[PDB]
Write a protein that binds this DNA or RNA. Structure first.
Ligand SMILES: [Mn+2]
Ligand SMILES: [Mn+2]
Length: 566
RNA sequence: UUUU
């Protein structure tokens, strides 16, 4: 069947769409070559559509049918609870889209009458109406990247399809738990979203060490969400239905499956009819959990067919990275070839063909890889990195365009040990932040999907609990990692690394001098900027009131919000 | 204007 069906009515905006980096006297401090930057807009959505729209052929062999049965048996283990409206409302991000029915995120979190009195009517319908497709909206997401080295190759806008605010709250009421528990339950260590970046690195290594002669690789299917067949979605529901649900829970899951998840009509920001979606909806709660299981399923099934000795895979939504036992160069090469032939048969073609790798630091998945460096005492230390182009790109864009969701903060947390995040991001912003003095001002960034309100003043404690004290003392970085950073810098036109120690030494001492948590930031977050690094003892609060549940499971697109870690 |  066709992933989508268009009518002519267009994907339209509802706000002003910039798409160039304004000559921000501060952006020039973080990035000279402004040009190198841009932000997707509506004007390039159709290109996205054409890319996205295609026919789907899928066939199900035995391996698939068996693997699935297995997953269901683990699923049978889980038990999910229904969620109270209060519980769902409070999970709604403070800035989520408002409802056509005259009420928004704020009215919800505060449990307005007009709000709940809708969520309630919405949840009743989900029990009274079992066939009617449910209306979804289609927007183009605003996204900033760096101009492709092909001077002109710009990424077309991404697309987001989400159901009304009321339908989203009910989703949480019926699946939140399922989605927060069931995945792991089914996939064991294969579930990516359960690790912090250091647990991921750790896992990736032990695993790579567990093979006599390891061979790893990753597989990136093309436009995953469109490759998802209404069959794929129905199967996912079979998995969900193995949990021990409450009838209204169980029934809602049913209703949403046929009414929202398998597909439905598309409306634009202006009430116009855009057409039909018959593939995964990018903006649903089940979006991630559904992708993780499908990638997992189809891959574990492809592995058997292709015959890869001792496969240990790591799934993260449509993101996949499998490590196994090598059988020979000319052997592995063909083996993987069979793997892509199976995956494809399952309606999961690759963007680029997968390539077997024999270096762990070379395998890259989820636009990041495993590199090495050294801690204080110099004991080798693994940390998870990535190419900083986008991150630096996005950060300069935000510096000039106060953005709703600060990708920079998110980067800092996740990649805290990276050379680029310590010397360039942390510096650039704490200078900004400290010049306006907004250290208490809690901004929003996001992790594995869900949103999070954090106070920059707590990075110290948060950074340690996720990376350890090594996060604040890594020095011998790998030559290759170093060149990757250096180069990106040159590209965007950013001043060499050694030049930031100076910009730091200061900002770091203007915090030292503010005492308190501020002074704590200055001590740990900038110890690399002093010609005399001082020893760092564990942070008291850090490991103490470490409010968690952070890396338990993905929710990208789910509209999930949590405000813990001060 | 919503956060795959
Ligand atoms: Mn894709
Ligand atoms: Mn990806």
């Amino acid at each position: 069947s066709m992933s989508y069906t268009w009518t002519g009515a267009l994907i339209t905006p509802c706000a002003a769409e910039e798409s160039k980096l304004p000559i921000n006297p501060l952006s020039n401090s973080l990035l000279r070559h402004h040009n190198m930057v841009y932000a997707t807009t509506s004007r390039s959505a159709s290109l996205r559509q054409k890319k996205v729209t295609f026919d789907r052929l899928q066939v199900l062999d035995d391996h698939y049918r068996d693997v699935l049965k297995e997953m269901k048996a683990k699923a049978s283990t889980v038990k999910a609870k229904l969620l109270s409206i209060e519980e769902a409302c409070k999970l709604t991000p403070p800035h989520s889209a408002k409802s056509k029915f005259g009420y928004g995120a704020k009215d919800v979190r505060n449990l307005s009458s007009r709000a709940v009195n809708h969520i309630r009517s919405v949840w009743e319908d989900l029990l009274e109406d079992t066939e009617t497709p449910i209306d979804t909206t289609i927007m183009a997401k605003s996204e900033v990247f760096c101009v492709q080295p092909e001077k002109g190759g710009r990424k077309p806008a991404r697309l987001i399809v989400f159901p009304d605010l009321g339908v989203r709250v009910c989703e949480k009421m019926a699946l939140y738990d399922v989605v927060s528990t069931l995945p792991q339950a089914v996939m064991g260590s294969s579930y990516g979203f359960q690790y912090s970046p250091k647990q991921r690195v750790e896992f990736l290594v032990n695993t790579w060490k567990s093979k006599k002669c390891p061979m790893g690789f990753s597989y990136d299917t093309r436009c995953f969400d469109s490759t998802v067949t209404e069959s794929d979605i129905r199967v996912e529901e079979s998995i969900y239905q193995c949990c021990d649900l409450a009838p209204e829970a169980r029934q809602a899951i049913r209703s949403l499956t046929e009414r929202l998840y398998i597909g439905g009509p598309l409306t634009n920001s202006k009430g116009q009819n855009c057409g039909y979606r018959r593939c995964r909806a990018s903006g649903v709660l089940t979006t991630s959990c559904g992708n993780t299981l499908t990638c997992y399923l189809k891959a574990t099934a492809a592995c058997r067919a292709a015959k890869l000795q001792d496969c240990t895979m790591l799934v993260n939504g449509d993101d996949l990275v499998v490590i196994c036992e090598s059988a020979g160069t000319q052997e592995d090469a063909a083996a993987l070839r069979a793997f892509t032939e199976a995956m494809t048969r399952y309606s999961a073609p690759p963007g680029d063909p997968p390539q077997p790798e024999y270096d762990l630091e070379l395998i890259t998945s989820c636009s990041s890889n495993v590199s090495v460096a050294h801690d204080a005492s110099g004991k080798r230390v693994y940390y998870l990195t990535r190419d900083p182009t986008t991150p630096l790109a996005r950060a300069a864009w935000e510096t000039a365009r106060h953005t709703p969701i600060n990708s920079w903060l998110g980067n800092i947390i996740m990649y805290a040990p990276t050379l680029w995040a310590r010397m360039i991001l942390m510096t650039h912003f704490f200078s900004i932040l400290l010049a306006q003095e907004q250290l208490e001002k809690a901004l929003d960034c996001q992790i594995y999907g869900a949103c999070y309100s954090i106070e920059p003043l707590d990075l110290p404690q948060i950074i340690e609990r996720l990376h350890g004290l090594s996060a604040f003392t890594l020095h011998s970085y790998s030559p290759g990692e170093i060149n990757r950073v250096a180069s990106c810098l040159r590209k965007l036109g950013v001043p060499p690394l050694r030049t930031w120690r100076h910009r730091a030494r200061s900002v770091r001492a203007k915090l030292l001098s503010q005492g308190g948590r501020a002074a704590t930031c200055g001590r740990y977050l900038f110890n690399w900027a002093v010609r005399t690094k001082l020893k760092l003892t564990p942070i008291p609060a850090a490991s103490q009131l470490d409010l968690s549940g952070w890396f338990v499971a993905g929710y990208s697109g789910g509209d999930i919000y949590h405000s813990l870690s001060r």
